[PDB]
């Protein structure tokens, strides 16, 4: 079934964003492990896997709609310290959140209700899992201090 060209193009925009999110969590998780914060490694490794699944869902939807997936990831922007890495991931998730919400509205406009539902599922993950957890970590650093927070992530 040929999808609407505007929807396919927009799904491709989201795909390159999620390929990038995957890769930013790839490098951050391994940096956290390099420093000995295995709890941070585990969480972000899980997030890398979740973004790979999100990318996969978009890629397969684009194919179903007879489009050609764009596989070049967006640029990533890793941090150099734990607070910078948390903030960088939160900025990325906030961007993905806004992009997904714009996509949902576009899908509704072009009456692509299945694509809308795929994006809604990803939007729920972004808001309620990914971004929320990051906000929590930054809030913990604010409440107990960075040194105590880092200790908790060994």
Cα separation, 81 vs 106, whole angstroms: 37
Residue 33 binding its own copies, by CB under 8 A? yes
Helix (H, G, I), strand (E, B) or coil at 46: helix
Minimum CB separation of residue 9 from its own copies in Å reads 17
Residue 43 binding Na ion, by CB under 5 A? no
Phi and psi at 81, nearest 5°, equal -140, 165
b/e map 47-72, b = 16+ CB within 10 Å: bbebbbebbebbbebbeebebebbee
Residue 61 binding Na ion, by CB under 5 A? no
- Calculate helix-pair angle for 5-34, 38-64, nearest 10 degrees: 160
Residue 136 binding its own copies, by CB under 8 A? yes
Residue 104 binding its own copies, by CB under 8 A? yes
Which phi-psi region, left, alpha or beta, contains residue 66 (left: φ > 0; alpha: ψ -120 to 50)? left
Residue 109 binding its own copies, by CB under 8 A? no
Cα separation, 53 vs 56, whole angstroms: 5
Enumerate residues 106-145 that contact Na ion by CB under 5 A. Answer: 126, 130
- Exactly one of 4, 13, 53, 78 binds its own copies (CB under 8 A); that residue is 78
**Which residues of the shown chain bind its own copies in the complex (CB under 8 A)?**
1, 19, 23-24, 26-27, 30-31, 33-36, 55-56, 59-60, 63-64, 69, 71-73, 75-76, 78, 82, 94, 97, 101, 104-105, 111, 113-114, 117, 120, 123-124, 127-128, 131-132, 135-137, 139-140, 143-145, 147-152, 154
Give the residue numbers of the binding site: 18, 46-47, 50-51, 54, 93, 129-130
């Amino acid at each position: 079934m040929q999808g609407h060209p505007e929807v396919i193009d927009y799904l491709n925009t989201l795909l390159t964003g999620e390929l990038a999110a995957r890769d930013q969590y790839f490098i951050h998780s391994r940096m956290y492990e390099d420093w000995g914060f295995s709890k941070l490694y585990e969480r972000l490794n899980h997030e890398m896997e979740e973004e790979t699944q999100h990318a996969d869902a978009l890629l397969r939807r684009i194919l179903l709609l007879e489009g050609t997936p764009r596989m070049r990831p967006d640029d990533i922007h890793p941090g150099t310290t734990v607070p910078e890495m948390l903030e960088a991931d939160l900025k990325l998730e906030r961007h993905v959140r806004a992009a997904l919400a714009k996509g949902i509205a576009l899908c509704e406009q072009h009456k692509d209700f299945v694509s809308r539902d795929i994006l809604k599922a990803q939007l729920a993950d972004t808001e309620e899992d990914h971004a929320y957890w990051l906000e929590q970590q930054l809030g913990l650093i604010a409440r107990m201090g960075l040194e105590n927070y880092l200790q908790s992530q060994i």
